[PDB]
Amino acid sequence: VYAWNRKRISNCVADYSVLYNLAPFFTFKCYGVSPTKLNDLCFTNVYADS
Amino acid sequence: PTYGVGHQPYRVVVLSFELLHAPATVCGPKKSTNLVKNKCVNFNFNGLK
Amino acid sequence: FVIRGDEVRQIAPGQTGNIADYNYKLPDDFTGCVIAWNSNKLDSKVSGN
Amino acid sequence: ALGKLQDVVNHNAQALNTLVKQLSSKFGAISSVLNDIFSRLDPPEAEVQ
């Protein structure tokens, strides 16, 4: 947690249905955007933390 | 394994979008029709109604 | 009706999924309550139901 | 010396200009543009926004 990592996701086509389905219990409370409408939108940059 | 559910490890992944949509590069799945000019139509350029 | 544990969310206004889309769909304007409970002791077979 | 006739036109034009310019205020919402705020958000909060 103290040394947290960043991976840059760019120049690709997203698919959030896989995350919807295959994760058993995954909370997924989101801020500033409706989760069910994440497929249509376009994003400047998507970064991943872990 | 004998620890309580409260102290069990959890994997957390945090996504950070940038919806200022200046270049737009990570557009999601969809399908693109043609372009028609000089006609009042419904356009959807880069997710903009 | 009876469903599995994972798709209990799909029975709710505004959410999508195979059960929500195809088996049971709630209206946008809904006035009511939903009750659900585990039925593992009651509807589960060793061979399979 | 015909300032009295000019002030009326100036006042009317300036008032119309400020009325047009007032559309830029976000009024505390996420965005001042309607189409994005419908597309970018879940309807229950869209109502108050």
Ligand SMILES: *[C@@H]1O[C@H](CO)[C@@H](O[C@@H]2O[C@H](CO)[C@@H](O)[C@H](O)[C@H]2NC(C)=O)[C@H](O)[C@H]1NC(C)=O
């Ligand atoms: C991570 O989990 C597995 C890799 O082990 C993959 O998910 C599989 O996706 C296929 C696609 O049809 C399914 O048939 C499998 O049932 C899935 N397996 C599991 C364990 O979920 C995939 O590589 C990754 N999935 C996600 C959501 O990250």
